[PDB]
Design a protein around this ligand. Structure first.
Ligand SMILES: OC[C@H]1O[C@@H](O[C@@H]2[C@@H](O)[C@H](O[C@@H]3[C@@H](O)[C@H](O[C@@H]4[C@@H](O)[C@H](O[C@@H]5[C@@H](O)[C@@H](O)O[C@H](CO)[C@H]5O)O[C@H](CO)[C@H]4O)O[C@H](CO)[C@H]3O)O[C@H](CO)[C@H]2O)[C@H](O)[C@@H](O)[C@@H]1O
Ligand code: BGC
Ligand code: ZN
Length: 241
């Protein structure tokens, strides 16, 4: 029951949307809920987004707003946190000193690749005697068939096997980023994938939490809700255990 969550930004109705979709948890890519009121029984998870998020005020805000902390967002990408492994490791003791359950930085891709961003982070954390409690991952599928759920699962299993930490899926959907602009599935293809993916993730015992990207169509064409109205994907996510 506890696995299903979502990423969110504020809007009139965001609270009722979080409640109605059945999110057990959420995050906002920031250290606090960014003005959002959590529904009863929905846990806020803070994030230290990037290098310049590592301050006394952000770390205090994070420890006051929740119990679990997510570290930097896609440091492997020039358009996101855009950090070396050395920079992430050098900042790590400040996140560790909060005492909160701590998630690895969330890499865009290649989490299972030897010599990749995550492999070098995990290996330096182990050499320095650091704590990494769990690994959050991002996945966007470019094959829009019933085969997509098996492909996402191969990726989560590859990362779980290499590092032996509980997995969170903090951002996923069907999106093909290989072309000049993003390519999306049909509404019926996206709804079917929501249904098959959540059933797979619910039974996959080393996955602790997952978060569809994202709650609102004002954030992304893969959104579940327009204002407080769910689309067929929103309906399929609400029905997931
Ligand atoms: O120094 C590195 C860069 O720092 C910037 O300054 C920081 C500033 O950006 C940051 O603000 C937060 C936003 O970055 C954050 O943005 C969210 C995205 O990261 C997220 O990205 C997803 C991605 O995770 C993946 O899933 O793929 C998705 C599809 O492509 C992609 O969208 O998307 C969400 C939804 O749109 C974004 O909201 O949002 C936070 C909440 O609003 C912001 O707080 O804050 C830090 C300080 O805390 C700043 O340092 C500079 O501007 C850059 O120039 C630097 O290179
Ligand atoms: O642009 C390329 C895309 O790569 C994906 O795998 C990342 O998660 C996105 O943040 C990014 O937009
Ligand atoms: Zn250093």
């Amino acid at each position: 029951g506890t696995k299903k969550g979502v990423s969110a930004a504020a809007f009139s109705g965001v609270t009722a949307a979080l409640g109605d979709v059945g999110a057990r948890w959420f995050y906002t890519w920031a250290a606090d809920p960014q003005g959002i009121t959590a529904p009863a029984g929905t846990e806020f998870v803070p994030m230290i987004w990037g290098r310049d998020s590592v301050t006394a005020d952000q770390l205090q805000r994070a420890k006051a707003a929740g119990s679990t902390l997510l570290a930097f967002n896609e440091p492997d990408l020039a358009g996101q946190a855009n950090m070396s492994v050395e920079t992430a490791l050098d900042l790590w003791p400040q996140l560790q000193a909060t005492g909160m359950r701590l998630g690895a930085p969330a890499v865009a891709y290649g989490g299972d690749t030897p010599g990749g961003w995550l492999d070098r982070f995990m290996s330096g954390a182990a050499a320095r005697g650091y704590r990494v409690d769990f690994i959050p991952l991002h996945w966007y599928g470019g094959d829009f068939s019933a085969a997509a759920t098996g492909q996402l699962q191969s990726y989560l299993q590859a990362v779980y096997n290499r590092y032996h930490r509980p997995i969170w899926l903090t951002a996923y959907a069907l999106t093909d980023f290989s072309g000049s602009t993003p390519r999306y599935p049909s509404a019926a293809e996206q709804a079917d994938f929501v249904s098959r993916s959540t059933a797979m993730l619910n039974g996959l015992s080393f996955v602790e939490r997952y978060a569809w990207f994202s709650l609102s169509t004002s954030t992304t064409p893969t959104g579940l809700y327009t204002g407080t109205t769910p689309n067929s994907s929103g309906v399929a996510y609400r029905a997931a255990g």
